Design an enzyme around this catalytic site. Structure first.
Site, PDB file in Angstrom:
ATOM      1  N   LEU A   9       0.817  -1.227   0.000  1.00  0.00           N
ATOM      2  CA  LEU A   9       0.000   0.000   0.000  1.00  0.00           C
ATOM      3  C   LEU A   9       0.848   1.274   0.000  1.00  0.00           C
ATOM      4  O   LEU A   9       0.333   2.348  -0.280  1.00  0.00           O
ATOM      5  CB  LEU A   9      -0.889   0.017   1.240  1.00  0.00           C
ATOM      6  CG  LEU A   9      -1.833  -1.181   1.378  1.00  0.00           C
ATOM      7  CD1 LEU A   9      -2.464  -1.183   2.752  1.00  0.00           C
ATOM      8  CD2 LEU A   9      -2.894  -1.151   0.286  1.00  0.00           C
ATOM      9  N   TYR A  26       7.789   5.613   8.679  1.00  0.00           N
ATOM     10  CA  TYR A  26       8.789   4.578   8.435  1.00  0.00           C
ATOM     11  C   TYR A  26       8.095   3.246   8.198  1.00  0.00           C
ATOM     12  O   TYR A  26       6.908   3.061   8.517  1.00  0.00           O
ATOM     13  CB  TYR A  26       9.797   4.477   9.593  1.00  0.00           C
ATOM     14  CG  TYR A  26       9.165   4.294  10.967  1.00  0.00           C
ATOM     15  CD1 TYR A  26       8.750   3.033  11.415  1.00  0.00           C
ATOM     16  CD2 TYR A  26       8.981   5.388  11.826  1.00  0.00           C
ATOM     17  CE1 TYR A  26       8.162   2.870  12.668  1.00  0.00           C
ATOM     18  CE2 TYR A  26       8.399   5.230  13.087  1.00  0.00           C
ATOM     19  CZ  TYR A  26       7.995   3.975  13.497  1.00  0.00           C
ATOM     20  OH  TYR A  26       7.448   3.808  14.721  1.00  0.00           O
ATOM     21  N   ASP A  60       1.136  14.369  14.514  1.00  0.00           N
ATOM     22  CA  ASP A  60       1.200  14.239  13.043  1.00  0.00           C
ATOM     23  C   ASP A  60      -0.175  14.153  12.390  1.00  0.00           C
ATOM     24  O   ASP A  60      -0.401  13.398  11.433  1.00  0.00           O
ATOM     25  CB  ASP A  60       2.093  13.042  12.644  1.00  0.00           C
ATOM     26  CG  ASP A  60       2.679  13.159  11.224  1.00  0.00           C
ATOM     27  OD1 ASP A  60       2.770  14.278  10.661  1.00  0.00           O
ATOM     28  OD2 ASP A  60       3.051  12.091  10.681  1.00  0.00           O
TER      29      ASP A  60
HETATM   30  C1  LIG Z   1      -6.685   0.480   0.243  1.00  0.00           C
HETATM   31  O1  LIG Z   1      -6.041   0.974   1.428  1.00  0.00           O
HETATM   32  C2  LIG Z   1      -5.073   1.952   1.419  1.00  0.00           C
HETATM   33  C3  LIG Z   1      -4.599   2.578   0.241  1.00  0.00           C
HETATM   34  C4  LIG Z   1      -3.619   3.564   0.284  1.00  0.00           C
HETATM   35  C5  LIG Z   1      -3.098   3.953   1.500  1.00  0.00           C
HETATM   36  C6  LIG Z   1      -3.559   3.362   2.682  1.00  0.00           C
HETATM   37  C7  LIG Z   1      -4.539   2.340   2.669  1.00  0.00           C
HETATM   38  N1  LIG Z   1      -5.079   1.700   3.822  1.00  0.00           N
HETATM   39  C8  LIG Z   1      -4.510   1.611   5.079  1.00  0.00           C
HETATM   40  N2  LIG Z   1      -5.205   0.999   6.043  1.00  0.00           N
HETATM   41  C9  LIG Z   1      -4.709   0.872   7.270  1.00  0.00           C
HETATM   42  C10 LIG Z   1      -3.428   1.370   7.632  1.00  0.00           C
HETATM   43  C11 LIG Z   1      -2.866   1.258   9.007  1.00  0.00           C
HETATM   44  N3  LIG Z   1      -3.452   0.589  10.038  1.00  0.00           N
HETATM   45  O2  LIG Z   1      -1.792   1.816   9.247  1.00  0.00           O
HETATM   46  C12 LIG Z   1      -2.721   2.038   6.572  1.00  0.00           C
HETATM   47  N4  LIG Z   1      -1.448   2.574   6.737  1.00  0.00           N
HETATM   48  C13 LIG Z   1      -0.700   3.247   5.744  1.00  0.00           C
HETATM   49  C14 LIG Z   1      -0.369   2.579   4.548  1.00  0.00           C
HETATM   50  F1  LIG Z   1      -0.846   1.358   4.305  1.00  0.00           F
HETATM   51  C15 LIG Z   1       0.401   3.178   3.564  1.00  0.00           C
HETATM   52  C16 LIG Z   1       0.880   4.457   3.773  1.00  0.00           C
HETATM   53  C17 LIG Z   1       0.600   5.132   4.953  1.00  0.00           C
HETATM   54  C18 LIG Z   1      -0.179   4.537   5.961  1.00  0.00           C
HETATM   55  C19 LIG Z   1      -0.494   5.290   7.239  1.00  0.00           C
HETATM   56  F2  LIG Z   1      -0.165   4.537   8.357  1.00  0.00           F
HETATM   57  F3  LIG Z   1       0.118   6.541   7.274  1.00  0.00           F
HETATM   58  F4  LIG Z   1      -1.863   5.462   7.304  1.00  0.00           F
HETATM   59  N5  LIG Z   1      -3.307   2.104   5.374  1.00  0.00           N
HETATM   60  C20 LIG Z   1      -2.031   5.017   1.603  1.00  0.00           C
HETATM   61  N6  LIG Z   1      -1.941   5.873   0.409  1.00  0.00           N
HETATM   62  C21 LIG Z   1      -0.738   6.720   0.479  1.00  0.00           C
HETATM   63  C22 LIG Z   1      -1.937   5.101  -0.859  1.00  0.00           C
HETATM   64  C23 LIG Z   1      -3.161   4.184  -1.023  1.00  0.00           C
END
Ligand SMILES: COc1cc2c(cc1Nc1ncc(C(N)=O)c(Nc3c(F)cccc3C(F)(F)F)n1)CN(C)CC2
Ligand SMILES: COc1cc2c(cc1Nc1ncc(C(N)=O)c(Nc3c(F)cccc3C(F)(F)F)n1)CN(C)CC2
Lengths: 291, 293
Positions: free
Chosen positions: A21, A26, A135
């Site tokens: 994702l 970090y 943040d």
């Molecule tokens: C389809 O789902 C997703 C698509 C996309 C993203 C995030 C999710 N979902 C998603 N769910 C749960 C978490 C979690 N428990 O931490 C998370 N963390 C996450 C990450 F997976 C990548 C980057 C950053 C973070 C963050 F922790 F900062 F939230 N993310 C991030 N986008 C930048 C691109 C597309």
């Protein structure tokens, strides 16, 4: 030793890794499926090289593990296997509000009102536990397929907490130190109300697609914020937004943290306490992604 | 990654005779040495510097020493890198620190302390004019040469803080959502140069009494007391030994609120340190006492 409850096993025993994702502060996060239940989870992977301080990851797990509130991403456990730490969390299927607004354009006032309410609930809870997110921004406010709102990425929070403990460990001899030097070593020099300011900025971000001063160099923004009688930012278009929304921004962006309202006080604010704020508003936003 | 653009890539033992180990400051170790050509004495600070070490603290220390040109700050003569050891060449101060001295002589006279305070203030005024903070003013870090002159030394804490600030600024991400009080702490660390004025006040008591105030109290307990509201700033123990001007000097230097604590420049106008009879002769007398007590 990263966590007393860590699973010393390959998370692939329990989870099928589906796709990367991307990354937060970090590490790298994978979408994954529980092999028994079929439930989706997020698995954050962090490399652990031989001479690494574990205190940041220790602190992040501790923060996640001791939260139990709907507006903070749920924690399911952690794994250590072949020098990779895996933190298992709730998955949010629509990604961040940033990911969404970069396709849809700016949120409606009601949509922003709902988001701010849900974030404030999360913040009130965190602050009740003496935790500070540090943040808060669109990128760290996640949306699931139900239109529900979760705070994510405690990486900054964890780093700060690790730094504070290190500063306390290595404070050294205090007999010649000025009280203000001692005070900032012990207490860190700010408090949880920093998150309320950050939410106010986020409200502008959701309204206008960028935070104030986004085009100005980040070091130069730090200088300008500290300079002079620094004026808190405002929403650009006066006529587009209600008196209550403008007031929400004024009050959240109180320069002095001695006068800035708490998360709990902010939950009584007109903008966020109004009837008709529910996940349906974000379901309408998620419909814009297809149509 | 570059330690020092002016680094000498040569063995300092080609140029200097190592005479004796003087001890160590915050980090590293220091030798008395003699220039083989001129005969001049120097201090050579040795610090181990392996190829994959963080250089930034030593980089910053050299930078601090190199860009100070002021009589009350230890002079800088250059640095050597040889066989994984960095050697920092500085002015030699033949009587050591004021701590080294008072542990033999006993407490300094009020005039002696007044002269030291003036000379440190001149050093501080200069440093503060350059946006530098010593952060470790104490008897152990104030050196005396054979001429009775006073020199600020060991910028190790200063260098560490400056290296930390640089790293914090390099890895400051996108700070658009940061509250002003957080931005303030990112840039400034939540205090300013007036911390050095407090430290001088404590040092003046150290020179007077052979210990800083509360030296017998556990240091964690001292930190607990300082951060309390209604912390009373310390005072000289014997009222009758010291003049109203020395008492006042302590009162103003130890102003709890840093918004109200006077600057180095303002302190140079203070009665105690503006006295006409302050000169190195006072320290020459102290060094004479050190020779045959
Ligand atoms: C389809 O789902 C997703 C698509 C996309 C993203 C995030 C999710 N979902 C998603 N769910 C749960 C978490 C979690 N428990 O931490 C998370 N963390 C996450 C990450 F997976 C990548 C980057 C950053 C973070 C963050 F922790 F900062 F939230 N993310 C991030 N986008 C930048 C691109 C597309
Ligand atoms: C006869 O001369 C000396 C005797 C003694 C000492 C220091 C000197 N002189 C001396 N001159 C110059 C310097 C310099 N340019 O930095 C210095 N630094 C230093 C050090 F050499 C050891 C320890 C700490 C520091 C400090 F940087 F903090 F000053 N020292 C230290 N005493 C503890 C024991 C006896």
């Amino acid at each position: 030793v990263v966590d007393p409850d860590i699973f010393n096993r390959d998370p692939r025993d329990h989870y099928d890794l589906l796709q990367r994702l991307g990354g937060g502060t970090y590490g790298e996060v994978f979408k994954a499926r529980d092999k028994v239940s079929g439930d989706l989870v997020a698995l954050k992977m962090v490399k652990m090289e031989p001479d690494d301080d574990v205190s940041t990851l220790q602190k992040e797990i501790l923060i996640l593990k001791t939260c139990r509130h709907a507006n903070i991403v749920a924690y399911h456990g952690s794994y250590l296997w072949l020098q990779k730490l895996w933190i298992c969390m709730e998955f949010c299927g629509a990604g961040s509000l940033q990911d969404i607004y970069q396709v849809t354009g700016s949120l409606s006032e009601l949509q922003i009102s709902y988001v701010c309410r849900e974030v404030l609930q999360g913040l009130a809870y965190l602050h009740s536990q003496k935790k500070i997110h540090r943040d808060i921004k669109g990128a760290n406010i996640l949306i699931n397929d139900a239109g529900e709102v979760r705070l994510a990425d405690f990486g900054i929070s964890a780093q700060i907490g690790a730094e504070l403990a290190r500063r306390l460990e290595f404070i050294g001899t205090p007999y010649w130190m000025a009280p203000e030097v001692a005070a900032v070593a012990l207490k860190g020099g700010y408090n949880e109300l920093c998150d309320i300011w950050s939410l106010g900025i986020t409200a502008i971000e959701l309204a206008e697609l960028q935070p104030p001063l986004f085009d100005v160099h980040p070091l130069r923004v730090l200088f300008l914020m500290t300079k002079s009688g620094y004026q808190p930012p405002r929403l650009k278009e006066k006529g587009k937004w209600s008196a209550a929304f403008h007031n929400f921004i004024k009050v959240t962006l109180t320069k002095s943290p001695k006068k800035r309202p708490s998360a709990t006080k902010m939950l009584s604010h007109q903008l966020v306490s109004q009837p008709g704020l529910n996940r349906g508003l974000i379901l309408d936003l998620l419909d814009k992604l297809k149509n």
